[PDB]
Amino acid sequence: MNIFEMLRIDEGLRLKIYKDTEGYYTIGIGHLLTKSPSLNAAKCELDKAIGRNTNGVITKDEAEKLFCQDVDAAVRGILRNAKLKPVYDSLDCVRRAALINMVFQMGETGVAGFCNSLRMLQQKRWDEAAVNLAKSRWYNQTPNRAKRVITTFRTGTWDAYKNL
Secondary structure, eight states, X not given: OOHHHXXXXXXXXXXXXXXXXXXXXXXXXXXXXOSOSOHHHHHHHHHHHHTXXXXXXXXXXXXXXXXXXXXXXXXXXXXXXXTHHHHHHHSOHHHHHHHHHHHHHXXXXXXXXXXXXXXXXXXXXXXXXXXXXXXXXXXXXXXXXXXXXXXXXXXXXXXXXXXX
């Protein structure tokens, strides 16, 4: 299991524009196109992202290319963030993937504000961090995904992604 396979499980793969869990136009492996309610706006974003007139449909290769970029962008933003970089650097490879997953879903700013959960992760108080991370809108709105990510932080294993 790795960050690509983990996010592929959590995000799915769809080749036509769809609405994500928040109602926002998305395509591929959770590639957010826009928060605009305008499907036309989402279509401009998509053609710009792919570099051709897509008419709202892409190929699997194209979806995987956006995913390559999106995972990289999540890591790059962690490394540029004064709150997230020390946490990321303190973590092992598996728990780093859990942090990347959170940032992919909610963005760098949101995750960076969880000052108590981040501290507990930095302190390697894994059960405490897991309890604290569940006190969140994130956990309540996407509990099955959050439980998997939290188990990854708690255990440092991929156990929550086995059988999926």
